[PDB]
């Protein structure tokens, strides 16, 4: 989620998404914790058997393979965590995440209400306003003229300055809002 | 509801699971140490370290986001920049 | 801010228009494909996959 | 460019000026004031007047006076062995039928 | 081996079972580049336009105005007379209009046949 | 009917001789006023009509309808206030001028007596309309959809003309009083059929009918807001009182001329909220269920029975409220971000909390939740259609299902969800809004505390 | 540790809601209480038979007192 | 109570056993009716005997108003617009005293339903043949007229139920 | 929607009717202005006017 997606995946990173995913389904599959890390060290060595493999044809054929046998023999409810996309907990906070632009629609009196937390807002709004010019500058100089070839974003090269395009980013809602 | 998360707690934790692997000593294991660089693991073994702190913390790490998590202190600055813990 | 230009027109039928169609969807000229011309009201618009 | 045609404006927030805008006027006081003669005028007179006038509208429909008459009719026809709703709407004697 | 899993238009094809997954030609990758650069550009653009302080209201998609042009207002002058699109209409448009008059005909015809016979159970029926 | 009429004619002065910063307060307050003042008319009797002179009576189908536009107009102004607040001093008056006229051309053809000068009447009521929309319309799309509403209702309502001149003529009078009492039963003729048809159609078109509906999403979604709030909560009910006005003088054959009609309404109705399933605009929805509802009170019309008038009746004091209300919601949200696209706006629950819960009422009293008058009216129909046949149960029933998976897709669209990101200028919801939707919600409910004054002279 | 928690504005729609409160119960308590006095002290008519030679009025022949009126 | 008329609203006489307990327990159903006629019965009977009160200070009455009857549609001459107007009305006034008929009687049969409870199908015999009866008769007077009913359409279905029935009594003679 | 809505019930009430107008408007206005051409329709016009009519 954090991390800028490539262009493809490498076949190391399939085969380790497909080993954790194995990973993950096994421990579904055996729930006891002595029977999953069993079968789990089976499943590990299974993956060091076909570790060191030079034809990469025929790695890529044990992959497929593999992912066939994945398929066939995928727990149909595997655990999800909570949290995550297939969780039961998942975008249950999301109704309750609101910005600070709506923050500042705020009338006087409820402004009034909050005199220390809006002086260091202006702060903030401050320095966001006084670094947009050489945030986009910095991102016109680095980018070769084709356009952007990938969705990272470059750091702060001087001292005073802030990384490009970072508002949103710091200033994002919290985990759990209210 | 649960106690909130701090820095030295999230360490604390993450150095436990990794001096309980048995691959990594924890006499040189500090928070610094490289996973395969200094470590000598490789990648199946950061796969199942990252699973044993996905354990622990009780949430996922996306694979887009695990594979660059080479060191203690990354999974730490990972763990507390996803749960929001700044002390 | 939107112009003529960049709005759904007819079907393409020479590969100066389904280029210029591509184009315009922000799209590969190789990974575009309208619909079939079967006078449905479709035009240029991209058939993208039946994927949710 | 092919005219000498004039910018799109900015949309314009009444808050900004009025922090204590009812959304009516630009004017602080017309928009109080718009504000005061809507709610006054529409909730209390309309809404509260004109219900309360239409529940204690006047019978003029007759239900009860339809329902009081059916309670005598139906008193005076069982009393007397007659049926209580009659077979016909009019007189068969008053009525001619074709040979 | 492993029974062999059929992919469906309500049950697609997963991309770990792909035939085209595993056979990957040089144009293919170079093909893949071209999309993360084009999805990297736009993505540039919008984020530019959404951290920019000064923006106040609506980043107009132009995306979006297309798929409510093309779905509304750009099918009557692409829509021409075809023996299919004619077919389509008439049985679509006509067909359920015969049918359901066919089918409460019949029915109140039958209702009325049993009223004149005299021999419908019409006792209580006050309201109608 | 002159303690009601003559008002009208002075709001008109009085909107042109008030200052310029003063026009809103005293046309909203004035209109407010004749409000209370035309709620007296529903103090109606159970045997005959109000007949006040020769030239206006009321009824208990009249009278509603009347309170139910007076009551419109100062709603109309504050969404116009809401919308025009840069327009000219000249141009303000103008469009208040034309909102004037409509109402007292709608008054007055409620009231109307005869067949003649209500078909004036109704026919004057296309000016203003159509000079509204085509000229504060938003888009392109104006001329186009004021030429299909104005081309539409005409051809519809021409052939009527001839046939109320000609029954001028064969009977001797147009008055309603008349032709109710000296009424003849219509044979099975060619010639007669194409009166029925004349006048039918007509009406139909007002309805509108199904195959005959195109003018009103084009006019309902391309008219500013009060424009979009008067079609369809007033001009689209002349239609179903003239074919509750007219029906008199055609029987017995409407038993079987209402066959087309019927089947047209029940599927165009189940078809129509299959529309409202696959709908891109707020707009459009909202004009496609009207098209619905008024389908279904076509079909009580047709079915011709004391449960159906009433079920008809209470369907479109209903349908009026709860459509006015759906629009100036959708109105309020397009103010905000400047287009039409439901999916454009998201999160706007966790954005605006009170404009949600009147998302959430009007939604309710769009589908049919008892004990609201919308259930009512629907309700009355449906027992009355299971009257007639026992198939219509099947239908209506897919049209219920249907209609409330439209309504609270259009709620889970709109107000769930999250937010759209980098929409940041919707600011809190204004008194002036909130007040609008309090003024929208309150008279149904209140009419459903009370539902015989809403359910027409067959009660 | 108390964290600020960030919320739309409020002020409108409870300053909306005061008013539209203080509106209704403008008119409304005073009604009701005119209401209450009239039904405790002003009771409803009773049914009689119309002496004989005398011709009634409209609001004589209505029943409850503010229909009456 | 003499608000409505027993003859109208028969009820049967009410026959209510008298307690016979068998046991030393007491009845929490009696100590509860004592607390609830103390606690609410005498303070509504209180404030009832005061607004009565102040009710029996200010009697006025109001009064039943009587129709008489007019020549109907069958006295009315053709297109005579002031005779069919009066018959007309009479028509619609008889229409909805009759509808309050139906009413009553049908109010008479879920009272005695509910009032018989389980012996329900045997004890309301005599209150439903009556309601069979009087919907019968009100269903042939005014079945199937039309959202458009009028005096002259009931005519001419009693007009038409007339020449059915001399047609059947022809044949039956025949 | 698509079929029925925005094609069909279109194409069959307000569009052919419009392009029907259209086009006998075209017919109509399409003259080149010549006295020649259209006093030989008066001829043809008063021949038939003549002959056609009794
Ligand atoms: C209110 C609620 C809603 C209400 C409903 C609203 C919606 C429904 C109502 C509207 C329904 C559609 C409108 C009616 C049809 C309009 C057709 C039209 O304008 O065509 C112009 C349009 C333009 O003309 P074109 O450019 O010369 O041809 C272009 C074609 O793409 C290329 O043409 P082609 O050369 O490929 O054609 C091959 C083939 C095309 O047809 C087919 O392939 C279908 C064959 C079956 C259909 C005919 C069945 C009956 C045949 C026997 C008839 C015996 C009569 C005695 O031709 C034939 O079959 C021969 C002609 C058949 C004529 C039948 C009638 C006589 O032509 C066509 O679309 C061609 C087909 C026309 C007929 C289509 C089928 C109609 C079926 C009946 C409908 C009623
Ligand atoms: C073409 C297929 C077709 O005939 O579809 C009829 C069908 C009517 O529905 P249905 O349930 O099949 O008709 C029931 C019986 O079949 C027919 O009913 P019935 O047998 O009980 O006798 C009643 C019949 C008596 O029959 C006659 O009077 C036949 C003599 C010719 C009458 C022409 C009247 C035209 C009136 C203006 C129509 C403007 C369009 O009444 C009519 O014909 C009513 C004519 C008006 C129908 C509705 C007009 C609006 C259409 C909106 C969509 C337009 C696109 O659809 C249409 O009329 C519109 C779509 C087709 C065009
Ligand atoms: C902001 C958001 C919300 C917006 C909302 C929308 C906007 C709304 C706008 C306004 C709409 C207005 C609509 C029109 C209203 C017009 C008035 C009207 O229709 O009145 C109706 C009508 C009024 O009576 P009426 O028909 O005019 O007179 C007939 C009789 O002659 C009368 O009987 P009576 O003469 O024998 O004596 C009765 C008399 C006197 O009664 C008594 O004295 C009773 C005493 C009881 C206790 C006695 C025992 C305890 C004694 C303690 C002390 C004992 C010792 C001392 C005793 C005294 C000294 C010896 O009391 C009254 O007359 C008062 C009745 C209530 C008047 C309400 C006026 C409303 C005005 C409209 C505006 C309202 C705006 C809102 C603000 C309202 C104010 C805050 O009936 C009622 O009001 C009934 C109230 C409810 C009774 C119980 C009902 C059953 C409850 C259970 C049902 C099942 C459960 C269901 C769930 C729970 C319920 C939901
Ligand atoms: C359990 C859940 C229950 C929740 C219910 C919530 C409501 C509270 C209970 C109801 C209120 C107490 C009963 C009040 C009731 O009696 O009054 C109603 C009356 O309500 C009003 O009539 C509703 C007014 C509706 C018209 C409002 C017009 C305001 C302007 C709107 C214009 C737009 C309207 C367009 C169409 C006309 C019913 O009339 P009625 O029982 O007999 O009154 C008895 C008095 N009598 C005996 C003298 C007759
Ligand atoms: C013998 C009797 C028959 C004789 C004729 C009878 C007429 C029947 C009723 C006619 C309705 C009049 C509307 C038609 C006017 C002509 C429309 C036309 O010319 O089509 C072209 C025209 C575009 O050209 P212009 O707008 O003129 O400008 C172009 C700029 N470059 O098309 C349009 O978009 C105009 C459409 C007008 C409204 C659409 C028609 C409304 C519905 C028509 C049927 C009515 C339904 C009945 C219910
Ligand atoms: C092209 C085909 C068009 C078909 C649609 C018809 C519209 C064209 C109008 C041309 C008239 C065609 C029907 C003529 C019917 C007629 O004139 O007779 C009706 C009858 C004649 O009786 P008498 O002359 O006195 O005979 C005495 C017998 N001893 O007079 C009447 O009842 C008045 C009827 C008015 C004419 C109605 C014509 C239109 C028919 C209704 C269609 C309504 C269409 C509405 C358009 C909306 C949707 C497009
Ligand atoms: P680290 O970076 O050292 O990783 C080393 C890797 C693996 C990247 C190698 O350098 C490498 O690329 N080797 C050659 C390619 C290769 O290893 N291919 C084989 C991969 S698949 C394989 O052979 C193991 C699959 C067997 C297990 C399949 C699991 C299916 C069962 C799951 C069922 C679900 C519930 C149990």
Same mark, same amino acid.
């Given at each position: 989620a954090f991390s800028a997606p490539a262009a493809y995946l490498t076949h190391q990173q399939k085969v380790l998404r497909l080993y954790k995913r194995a990973l993950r389904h096994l421990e579904s599959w055996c729930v006891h914790r002595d029977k999953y890390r069993y079968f789990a060290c089976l499943m590990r060595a299974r993956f060091d058997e076909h570790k060191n493999e030079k034809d990469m044809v025929k790695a890529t054929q044990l992959l497929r393979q593999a992912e066939e046998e994945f398929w066939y023999g995928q727990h149909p409810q595997p655990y999800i965590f909570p949290e995550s996309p297939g969780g039961t907990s998942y975008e249950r906070y999301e109704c309750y995440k609101v910005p600070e632009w709506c923050l500042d629609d705020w009338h006087p009196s409820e402004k009034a209400m909050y005199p220390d937390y809006f002086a260091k807002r202006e702060q903030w709004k401050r320095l966001r306003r006084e670094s947009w010019e050489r945030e986009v500058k910095q991102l016109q100089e680095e980018t070769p003229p084709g356009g952007p070839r990938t969705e990272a974003l470059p750091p702060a090269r001087k001292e005073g300055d802030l990384p490009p395009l970072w508002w949103h980013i710091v200033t994002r809602p919290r985990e759990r809002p209210m | 509801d649960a106690p909130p998360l701090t820095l030295e707690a999230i360490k604390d934790r993450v150095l436990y699971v990794l001096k309980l692997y048995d691959k990594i000593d924890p006499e040189k294991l500090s928070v610094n140490s490289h996973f395969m660089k200094d470590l000598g693991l490789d990648s199946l073994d950061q796969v199942e370290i990252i699973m044993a702190m996905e354990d622990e913390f009780g949430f996922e790490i996306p694979d887009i986001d695990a594979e660059k998590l080479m060191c203690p202190q990354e999974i730490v600055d990972y763990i507390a920049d996803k749960k929001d813990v700044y002390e | 801010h939107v112009t003529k230009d960049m709005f759904p027109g007819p079907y393409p039928k020479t590969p100066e228009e389904r280029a210029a169609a591509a184009k315009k969807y922000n799209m590969r000229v190789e990974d575009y494909e309208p619909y079939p011309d079967d006078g449905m009201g479709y035009g240029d618009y991209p058939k993208l996959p039946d994927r949710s | 460019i092919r005219l000498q045609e004039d910018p799109d404006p900015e949309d314009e927030n009444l808050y900004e000026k009025n922090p204590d805008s009812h959304g009516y006027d630009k004017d602080p006081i017309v928009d109080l004031w718009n504000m005061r003669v809507v709610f006054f005028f529409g909730f209390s007179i309309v809404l509260v007047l004109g219900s309360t006038f239409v529940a204690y509208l006047p019978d003029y429909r007759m239900q009860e006076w339809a329902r009081r008459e059916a309670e005598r009719l139906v008193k005076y026809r069982e009393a007397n062995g007659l049926p209580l709703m009659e077979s016909n709407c009019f007189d068969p004697n008053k009525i001619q039928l074709p040979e | 081996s492993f029974p062999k899993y059929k992919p469906s238009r309500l049950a697609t094809l997963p991309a770990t079972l792909d035939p085209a997954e595993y056979d990957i030609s040089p144009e293919t990758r170079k093909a893949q580049a071209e999309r993360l650069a084009i999805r990297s550009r736009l993505k540039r653009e919008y984020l530019l336009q959404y951290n920019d302080p000064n923006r106040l209201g609506v980043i107009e998609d132009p995306a979006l105005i297309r798929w409510t042009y093309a779905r509304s207002a750009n099918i009557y002058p692409n829509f021409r007379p075809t023996p299919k699109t004619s077919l389509l209409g008439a049985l679509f448009g006509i067909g359920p209009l015969f049918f359901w008059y066919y089918v409460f005909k019949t029915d109140r015809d039958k209702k009325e046949k049993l009223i004149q016979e005299g021999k419908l159970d019409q006792t209580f029926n006050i309201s109608y | 009917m002159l303690k009601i009429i003559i008002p009208t004619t002075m709001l008109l002065p009085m909107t042109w001789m008030s200052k310029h910063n003063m026009i809103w307060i005293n046309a909203t307050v004035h209109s407010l006023l004749? !409000? =209370?003042?035309? %709620?007296?008319?529903?103090?109606?009797?159970?045997?005959? *009509?109000?007949?006040? /002179?020769?030239? +206006?009576?009321?009824?208990?189908?009249?009278?509603?309808?009347?309170?139910?536009?007076?009551?419109?107009?100062?709603?109309?102004?504050?969404?116009?206030?809401?919308?025009?607040?840069?327009?000219?001093?000249?141009?303000?008056?103008?469009?208040?001028?034309?909102?004037?006229?409509?109402?007292?051309?709608?008054?007055?053809?409620?009231?109307?007596?005869?067949?003649?000068?209500?078909?004036?009447?109704?026919?004057?009521?296309?000016?203003?309309?159509?000079?509204?929309?085509?000229?504060?319309?938003?888009?392109?799309?104006?001329?186009?959809?004021?030429?299909?509403?104005?081309?539409?209702?005409?051809?519809?309502?021409?052939?009527?003309?001839?046939?109320?001149?000609?029954?001028?003529?064969?009977?001797? !009078? =147009?008055?309603? %009083?008349?032709?109710?009492?000296?009424?003849?039963?219509? *044979?099975?003729?060619? /010639?007669?059929? +194409?009166?029925?048809?004349?006048?039918?159609?007509?009406?139909?078109?007002?309805?509108?009918?199904?195959?005959?509906?195109?003018?009103?999403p084009k006019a309902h979604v391309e008219a500013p807001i009060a424009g979009s709030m008067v079609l369809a909560a007033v001009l689209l009910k002349l239609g179903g009182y003239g074919m509750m006005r007219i029906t008199t003088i055609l029987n017995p054959l409407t038993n079987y001329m209402a066959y087309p009609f019927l089947m047209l309404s029940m599927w165009g109705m189940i078809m129509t909220s299959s529309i409202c399933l696959r709908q891109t605009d707020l707009k459009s929805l909202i004009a496609y269920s009207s098209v619905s509802h008024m389908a279904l009170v076509i079909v009580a019309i047709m079915i011709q029975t004391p449960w159906s008038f009433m079920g008809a009746t209470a369907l479109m004091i209903a349908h009026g409220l709860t459509s006015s209300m759906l629009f100036c919601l959708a109105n309020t949200n397009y103010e905000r971000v400047h287009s039409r696209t439901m999916i454009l706006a998201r999160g706007l629950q966790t954005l605006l909390p009170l404009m949600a819960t009147w998302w959430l009422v009007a939604s309710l009293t769009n589908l049919a939740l008892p004990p609201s008058i919308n259930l009512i009216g629907e309700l009355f129909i449906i027992t009355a259609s299971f009257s007639w046949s026992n198939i219509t149960i099947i239908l209506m029933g897919m049209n219920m299902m249907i209609t409330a998976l439209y309504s609270l897709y259009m709620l889970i669209t709109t107000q769930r969800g999250k937010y759209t990101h980098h929409i940041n200028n919707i600011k809190p919801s204004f008194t002036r809004e909130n007040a609008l939707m309090a003024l929208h919600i309150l008279p149904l409910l209140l009419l459903t505390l009370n539902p015989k004054m809403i359910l027409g002279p067959l009660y | 540790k108390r964290l600020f928690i960030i919320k739309p504005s409020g002020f409108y729609d409870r300053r909306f809601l005061k008013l539209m409160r203080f509106y209704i119960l403008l008119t409304g308590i005073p009604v009701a209480i005119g209401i209450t006095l009239v039904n405790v002290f002003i009771g409803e008519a009773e049914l009689a038979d119309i002496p004989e030679g005398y011709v009634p009025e409209h609001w004589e022949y209505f029943k409850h007192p503010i229909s009456r009126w | 109570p003499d608000s409505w008329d027993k003859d109208v609203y028969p009820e049967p006489p009410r026959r209510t056993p008298a307690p016979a307990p068998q046991t030393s327990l007491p009845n929490p159903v009696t100590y509860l009716t004592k607390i609830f006629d103390l606690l609410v019965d005498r303070p509504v009977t209180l404030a009832r005997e005061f607004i009565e009160q102040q009710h029996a200070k200010n009697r006025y009455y109001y009064y039943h108003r009587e129709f008489r009857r007019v020549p109907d549609i069958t006295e009315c001459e053709e297109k005579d617009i002031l005779c069919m107007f009066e018959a007309e009305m009479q028509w619609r006034r008889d229409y909805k005293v009759d509808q309050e008929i139906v009413n009553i009687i049908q109010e008479r049969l879920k009272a005695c339903q509910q009032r018989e409870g389980e012996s329900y199908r045997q004890n309301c015999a005599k209150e439903l043949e009556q309601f069979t009866q009087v919907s019968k008769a009100f269903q042939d007077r005014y079945s199937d007229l039309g959202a458009h009913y009028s005096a002259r359409k009931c005519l001419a279905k009693q007009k038409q139920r007339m020449l059915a029935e001399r047609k059947a009594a022809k044949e039956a003679a025949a | 929607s698509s079929l029925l809505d925005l094609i069909w019930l279109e194409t069959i009430l307000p569009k052919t009717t419009s392009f029907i107008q259209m086009k006998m408007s075209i017919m109509v206005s399409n003259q080149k202005g010549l006295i020649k051409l259209y006093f030989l329709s008066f001829l043809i016009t008063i021949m038939i006017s003549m002959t056609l009519f009794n």
């Open positions: - | - | - | - | - | 004749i !409000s =209370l003042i035309s %709620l007296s008319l529903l103090n109606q009797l159970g045997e005959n *009509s109000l007949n006040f /002179s020769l030239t +206006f009576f009321s009824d208990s189908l009249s009278a509603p309808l009347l309170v139910l536009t007076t009551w419109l107009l100062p709603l109309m102004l504050m969404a116009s206030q809401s919308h025009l607040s840069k327009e000219t001093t000249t141009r303000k008056k103008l469009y208040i001028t034309m909102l004037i006229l409509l109402q007292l051309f709608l008054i007055m053809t409620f009231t109307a007596t005869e067949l003649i000068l209500f078909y004036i009447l109704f026919e004057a009521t296309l000016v203003p309309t159509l000079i509204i929309i085509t000229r504060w319309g938003n888009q392109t799309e104006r001329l186009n959809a004021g030429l299909y509403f104005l081309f539409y209702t005409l051809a519809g309502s021409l052939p009527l003309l001839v046939a109320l001149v000609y029954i001028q003529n064969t009977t001797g !009078s =147009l008055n309603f %009083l008349i032709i109710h009492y000296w009424s003849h039963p219509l *044979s099975n003729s060619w /010639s007669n059929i +194409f009166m029925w048809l004349a006048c039918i159609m007509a009406f139909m078109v007002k309805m509108p009918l199904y195959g005959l509906h195109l003018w009103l | - | - | -």
